[PDB]
Scaffold this active site. Sequence first.
Site, short mmCIF file in Angstrom:
data_model
loop_
_atom_site.label_atom_id
_atom_site.label_comp_id
_atom_site.label_asym_id
_atom_site.label_seq_id
_atom_site.Cartn_x
_atom_site.Cartn_y
_atom_site.Cartn_z
N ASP I 43 0.84 -1.19 0.00
CA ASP I 43 0.00 0.00 0.00
C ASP I 43 0.88 1.25 0.00
OD1 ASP I 43 -0.93 0.35 3.52
OD2 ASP I 43 0.88 -0.45 2.59
C1 LIG Z 1 7.84 13.61 15.84
C2 LIG Z 1 6.86 14.74 16.12
C3 LIG Z 1 5.78 14.85 15.06
C4 LIG Z 1 5.01 13.55 14.88
C5 LIG Z 1 3.56 13.64 15.35
C6 LIG Z 1 2.58 13.24 14.26
C7 LIG Z 1 1.22 12.83 14.82
C8 LIG Z 1 0.32 12.21 13.75
C9 LIG Z 1 -0.03 10.76 14.06
C10 LIG Z 1 -1.50 10.44 13.77
C11 LIG Z 1 -1.84 10.54 12.29
C12 LIG Z 1 -3.09 9.73 11.92
O1 LIG Z 1 -3.22 8.63 12.34
S1 LIG Z 1 -4.36 10.46 10.85
C13 LIG Z 1 -5.45 9.13 10.25
C14 LIG Z 1 -6.13 9.56 8.95
N1 LIG Z 1 -7.20 8.64 8.61
C15 LIG Z 1 -7.48 8.37 7.21
O2 LIG Z 1 -6.84 8.89 6.37
C16 LIG Z 1 -8.60 7.40 6.83
C17 LIG Z 1 -8.75 7.03 5.35
N2 LIG Z 1 -7.63 6.22 4.92
C18 LIG Z 1 -7.08 6.38 3.59
O3 LIG Z 1 -7.56 7.18 2.85
C19 LIG Z 1 -5.90 5.52 3.12
O4 LIG Z 1 -6.03 4.24 3.67
C20 LIG Z 1 -4.56 6.11 3.54
C21 LIG Z 1 -4.41 6.09 5.06
C22 LIG Z 1 -4.44 7.55 3.05
C23 LIG Z 1 -3.43 5.29 2.93
O5 LIG Z 1 -3.58 5.28 1.54
P1 LIG Z 1 -2.94 4.02 0.70
O6 LIG Z 1 -3.08 2.76 1.52
O7 LIG Z 1 -3.67 3.86 -0.61
O8 LIG Z 1 -1.48 4.27 0.42
#
Ligand SMILES: CCCCCCCCCCCC(=O)SCCNC(=O)CCNC(=O)[C@H](O)C(C)(C)COP(=O)(O)O
Lengths: 178, 111, 128, 459, 104, 62, 220, 67, 88, 175, 124
Positions: I43
């Site tokens: 992915d």
């Molecule tokens: C070091 C200091 C900085 C760090 C801190 C950062 C904190 C952020 C951590 C939390 C971030 C999250 O979880 S934010 C979670 C966001 N949720 C979603 O995006 C749901 C829908 N999912 C999709 O569209 C795809 O599965 C996708 C995921 C794009 C993948 O795409 P592919 O599979 O086609 O590659």
Amino acid sequence: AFSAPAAYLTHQQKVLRLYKRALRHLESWCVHRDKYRYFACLMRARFDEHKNEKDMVKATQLLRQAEEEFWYGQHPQPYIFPESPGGTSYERYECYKVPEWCLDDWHPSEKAMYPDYFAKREQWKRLRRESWEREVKQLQEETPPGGPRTEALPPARKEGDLPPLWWHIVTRPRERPM
Amino acid sequence: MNPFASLTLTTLTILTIPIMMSNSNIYKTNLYPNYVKTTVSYAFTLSLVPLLMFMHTGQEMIISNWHWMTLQTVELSLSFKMDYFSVMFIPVALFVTWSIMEFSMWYMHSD
Amino acid sequence: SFPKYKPSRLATLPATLDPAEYDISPETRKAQAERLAIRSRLKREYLLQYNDPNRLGVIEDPALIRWTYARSANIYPNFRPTPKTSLLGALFGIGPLFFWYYVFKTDRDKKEKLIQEGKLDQTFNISY
Amino acid sequence: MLKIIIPTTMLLPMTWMSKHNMIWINATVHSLLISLISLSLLNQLGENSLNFSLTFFSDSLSAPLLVLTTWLLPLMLMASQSHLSKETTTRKKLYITMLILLQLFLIMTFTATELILFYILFEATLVPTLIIITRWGNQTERLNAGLYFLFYTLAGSLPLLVALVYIQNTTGSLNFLIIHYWSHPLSNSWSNIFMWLACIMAFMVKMPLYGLHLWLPKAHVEAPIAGSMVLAAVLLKLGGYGMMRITTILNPLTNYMAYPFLMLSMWGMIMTSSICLRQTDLKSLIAYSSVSHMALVIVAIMIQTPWSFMGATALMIAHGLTSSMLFCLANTNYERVHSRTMILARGLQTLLPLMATWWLVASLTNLALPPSINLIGELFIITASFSWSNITIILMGMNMMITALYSLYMLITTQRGKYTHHINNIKPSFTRENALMALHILPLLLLTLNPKMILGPLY
Amino acid sequence: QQERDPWYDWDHPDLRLNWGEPIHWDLDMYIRNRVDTSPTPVSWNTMCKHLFGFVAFMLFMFWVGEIYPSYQPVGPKQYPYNDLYLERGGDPTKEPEPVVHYEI
Amino acid sequence: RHSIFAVTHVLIPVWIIHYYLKYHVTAKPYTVVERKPRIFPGDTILETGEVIPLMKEFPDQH
Amino acid sequence: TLCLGAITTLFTALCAITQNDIKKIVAFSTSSQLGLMMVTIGINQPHLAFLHICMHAFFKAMLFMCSGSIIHSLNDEQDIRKMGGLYKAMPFTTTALIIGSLALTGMPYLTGFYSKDLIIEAVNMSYTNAWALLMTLIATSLTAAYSTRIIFFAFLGKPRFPPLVLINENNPLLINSIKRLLIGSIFAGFIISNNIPPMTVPNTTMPLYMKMTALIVTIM
Amino acid sequence: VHIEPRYRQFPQLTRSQLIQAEFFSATMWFWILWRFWHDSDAVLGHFPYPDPSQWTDEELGILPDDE
Amino acid sequence: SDAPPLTLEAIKDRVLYVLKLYDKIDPEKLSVNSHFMKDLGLDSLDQVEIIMAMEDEFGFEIPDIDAEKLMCPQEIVDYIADKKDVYE
Amino acid sequence: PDSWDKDVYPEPPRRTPAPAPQTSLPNPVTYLTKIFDLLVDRPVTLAREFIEQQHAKNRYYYYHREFRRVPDITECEEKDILCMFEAEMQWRRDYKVDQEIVNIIQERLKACQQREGESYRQNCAKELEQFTQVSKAFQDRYSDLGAHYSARKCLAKQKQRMLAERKAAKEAAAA
Amino acid sequence: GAHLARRYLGDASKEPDPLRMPTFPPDYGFPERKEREMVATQQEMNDAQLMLQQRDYCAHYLIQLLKCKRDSFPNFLACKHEQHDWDYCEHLDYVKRMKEFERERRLLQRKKRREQREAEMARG
Ligand SMILES: CCCCCCCCCCCC(=O)SCCNC(=O)CCNC(=O)[C@H](O)C(C)(C)COP(=O)(O)O
Ligand SMILES: CCCCCCCC/C=C/CCCCCCCC(=O)OC[C@H](COP(=O)(O)OCCN)OC(=O)CCCCCCC/C=C/CCCCCCCC
Ligand SMILES: CCCCCCCC/C=C\CCCCCCCC(=O)O[C@H](COC(=O)CCCCCCC/C=C/CCCCCCCC)COP(=O)(O)OCCN
């Protein structure tokens, strides 16, 4: 830098860009390799924990919260690759880059040295002079009446055509000209 | 005639010879950096002598050799001070410069 | 959850911290498409002359000409005497002159008064 | 001193009798010979001036100015012949005639013993300059510039004439020697105050004084290259020379009167230096720099001390040379790219290395790097001002900073960075341009080698 | 100009400008050789408090340490010939007040 | 060819400098000024031949 | 002058300890040393300040030279976060940097000792501002702190540079230059101190704890 | 001396650089030890610091709180 | 001297070397023309990690807009060769 | 040397101590000065003898110009231009000579300061006193005249000072 | 340090003032005091050009040390005895200054305590 940008970024594109930025800044905080691997795997798990959210509104809210957390917890002095736009050798070798048209201004004494190079240069100039009109015609035909929506260019499609607008991409000076 | 003044002036004088030669057929070759480094090393070993003289007898000097211009009451002249500070700092700077140019020989090779 | 960031004039707001880029509308998408179309048309117009084999010279930029003309020759035709303009002109063109005049006049009056009484320590003051 | 005046009047028919393809050669050679002849005026005395006749005299203040004028003529000849190639023979001869007439008027102006003859010549210098600007300028604003150059001058100089004749009805003479020997104090009355203003404001507008300087950016930007060279190098120094001459009759009214001009000059040097920091045109930056330096010279003349006078003389000569060199440097790029925008052509050190070396030396001399005569004059003026009042070191000090900034800014904008991609017609520098730069720059350092020759009569 | 995307193919790379787009009124002030307005990791008005507090605290503590100086528990240094009266400026025709030091 | 550098870059400049200082700079007053040599008790002067006495019979804090 | 030198040395030493560019660390180090010289001038000891300038030149130039050697070896990389174990990979550079750091921190009988130790003990035994004394002491502690930072992050541990190893310091010019500056940084202090006439009045009566203050703060 | 890259292995070393490095560290430590042995008072001090409390009143010339 | 004149074969070898050290891709089934999403079944996050691994390997950074389009090792090596001016 | 008069530019008798070696070691300074003598001072001396031999075969003289004394600005009528001109030139010449006298005294002061080393604050009191007197006289004569100075303004300044002194003396006598 | 704490936190009156010292007559507590003598003449110190600060009561040892250093020039490790004598003289001078400081301190303490006790006695 090589690819034509789009009108906007999609949700997955912003998600991936935030993922890369978070990983790079976490590596900046975790200097040693094993600690970085541990915390990067933790970040990846935290990141794909909400991977299967079918609600786009909650997805954007989670992205917004993640970006706020990133901005609060970013490294003020992150690692930059030396040749990247922030590196210590970013534009170091730009003063050594000289455009090719300058070679037209050389004295015939200077051109007496390197005869074969200038013969090859004349061949290249003839090729460009011959291909220009076909490039212009192809660009005219492919383009829509209103104008071109994106910055992408078409390739050569005919028997001996060259891709339109190729001269200044092919004849780049160098990355280490001197 | 007390070689202190002559040697102190020669040390500063011989540093400019490569600057004058920078328009000859040595500024276009690959031997110019070595020429400049050799000149600096020679200047250092020459400047070592007034330091020994001062360390022996505490000799200090001022040399007002050229009269540049004189206002009504203020006379402006090319004058050099060879007290303890000058004769102690010149060899140190020459030594450091010699080492640094020899280093730059290798560090700036691809420039 | 975390302490917040407040933008300023010399430290602006990041794109990822901008709430306008997280609540988007089809109108916004259409506007972005139009902006990209304009930029692409300009880029094609530039590249057509940039790669021209027969082009010798400089490619005239109407934007640069407009910028220089607006910064130089379009200013006086668009000037109106208003209370703000009058006050700012009077202040910035009058206040410093009288401020410096008062400072220098006071200093020289003090020096002359001290000289008259004969207590300034002017020994060795040959050159003036 | 007809041994210098007559050869220029002979330069006239030589130009008008020359072959169509030999005018520049003859003019340059004989102008250089005239400069060599005029070099003999530097042998000055220590007590009085060289009184050649009842009409002409040479002082230690005017001889360096005469030498500068006679040296500048061949430089303008060399600079002009590039952009006048397509011009017809008659118009080229007319342009050379205008330059020769200007040099003749300046030579006769700097040595006139009477103040009224000085006035007549110092006003006769207007016509050739105006003709040059309004005929051989390039853009449409030149006409307007000419008007600004003309009336701004005349509005200042018409009252002076009145004052001049009035003085001759009171003292009976305008001869500078008799005026100096029979000097009398000026009382504190309204009539004397207005006499002071009439005697001073013409020279103030010629420098120009801040607030009266609006003609200068227009005239120096719209003029051709030779016009700019002569405007910045010599024509600005007429005001300083005239002020240093005329101040001998204005004492002791000068102490009370000078204050507004001193404050205007100091705050105006600050303001013009600041203006140079945000300028999109390359010629306007040099013009405003000239205004700043001339404001310093105004302060030097106004405080009226020997050190200030030496500083004024040195700074005037140094600024003339430096400004002429800078205008020529800018004109080279303009002739290449046919535009005056400063950010249009960048990274020229990559394409023109020796031209970049010339740019560096000119910018270094502009910011008064020691031991150049620029720094000598500036430091003498600063010391005199410090003696006048210890607070001046603030304003002068600020100037010394801002100047350097914009100077280096200019260099960094033009020579460093990366070249503009679409500009593909930067031909290699010609021998003519390099020789022009060298002939500008070498006399400056040679003068540094012997500074008492440009320090004026107070030395 | 610093906040423009550096990974885009600008017509002018060093200036980060495109041919034909409108130019800001204050471009020469924002040329990125000059005033920069990029977002900072720490908020503006928070850097100001910290810097001003540091400077003011250091100034106040320097004043405090000046009015409460540090010294060794010793008396003044003593010099033989009437505090070297003739050495520190001569004046050999005044017979100054004698400075006498005793053993202890 | 081996030691030519020490002649054209050290010996000739020092010859010129020494000649200029000895026969031109010194020919004017107060051009080269040296602080007086230090004098200590028990020393003998070259010019006069005078000797300097000893130092007031140290108390010998052995 | 004393207050300006004290605030400068403290501020620059405090800024140095969190930097990640090696050149930045060395620059803040020399700025703090200049502040220390300013402090020395402020207590009416100009000859001590001149002596410290002369001592400092040697090991500061050598430290920058070793940093440049590391930069060249690791493909023009300057961040200490991508420098691993160079103690064994770069032996001569390692010993040169160790000697330079020990001289900068005023290890006894090295070149930096014969000026820095005297400066510290002259500041401790003068009628001076108290805050300036405290800031000088804190700065001379932070000096050892950032020297430790450089050594720890650049020479100890496991590699953090890209896998194409191009480390090669076997070049006679680099070795000769660094060795000359090394001999200087080892012996110049003693040679110069013993060969100069006494231009100051020494401090011969000092409490034992105050005599060893520089060493104690350095080890702390 | 020709030294080639390694690609994820320890770089090649010549005996001369180890010899020079060890020799220079050794002479640094020898100089420190020798100077400490011969000039110890430069670090530990030379003259004993007196304690003023053990100074008699008669020596300081102070009257017995009566006059 | 400086770093050797990097060639296309070296670029391909290093890219493949980095790829077989990814625990999620088996070495044997991996080929130069293998699509990351179809054949190996990765992915987008895995692609991002692969791009960062490439950046660490070659010591320079690839912008995200270009990095998104690289989907098989041949494209990776072609991008590296074009960036560093490699023709042999 | 005899190039200058030793009364205008005096120097002390230059006592220098004799060498007192106390080591069996050689003296590097002595060896180096012997090499410097043999290698530099002898060829330079020979070149100077050749130059002086050439100079002696062509000997010619130049003279110091003598200026008579003409009436001062005080003996000049109000508008007599020629007497004013002569007085003005004489006054300018005297101003230049006074500047040179001050220059000579300052040169003495600087030479004393450099010569006396660490004892300059006591060993150069006479030179400082001479410079103080000369500077006071010069400042009374010429200071504050400004640019465009003349003998007439100097005379006006002297008359003003004399009037002030006469008034002060007359007032103090009445005390 | 302890004197700084005793003065800043301690009563100001009891502690001596470094700038204003001494405040009591030199022969107050002593029946008689010898005048401290100087070995080096002013002329010798002027010829030696020592310094305006090095011309203290230990100047004779400094003159001896400078002469020894000049005589034994190439052997810059030969002037160890003279250096030690000069250092010892400086140490004695510093010890005497400490003696003077302590004298002022205890004189101030005893005087103020005695005055307060006499005032208390006369107040009853
Ligand atoms: C070091 C200091 C900085 C760090 C801190 C950062 C904190 C952020 C951590 C939390 C971030 C999250 O979880 S934010 C979670 C966001 N949720 C979603 O995006 C749901 C829908 N999912 C999709 O569209 C795809 O599965 C996708 C995921 C794009 C993948 O795409 P592919 O599979 O086609 O590659
Ligand atoms: C005494 C009179 C002058 C006193 C100083 C008053 C303030 C002067 C202000 C000058 C303004 C000039 C503006 C034009 C210059 C061009 C703009 C410019 O310089 O760009 C800013 C450029 C970019 O910043 P970087 O951090 O390097 O970013 C690079 C990475 N991207 O950086 C600079 O050059 C800024 C320099 C400005 C310094 C002004 C602050 C100085 C204040 C001094 C006060 C302290 C006095 C000293 C006391 C010591 C005790 C005696
Ligand atoms: C681009 C700007 C240039 C414009 C500046 C022009 C202004 C110049 C200053 C005014 C000059 C006018 C004076 C003319 C000559 C005066 C000579 C003189 O001495 O005459 C006086 C008389 O003085 C006058 O008559 C002057 C009166 C002024 C009349 C004209 C007014 C012009 C404008 C005045 C205000 C301008 C202020 C300066 C300009 C400011 C900048 C805008 C003595 O004559 P008597 O009658 O014999 O007196 C003794 C016996 N009773």
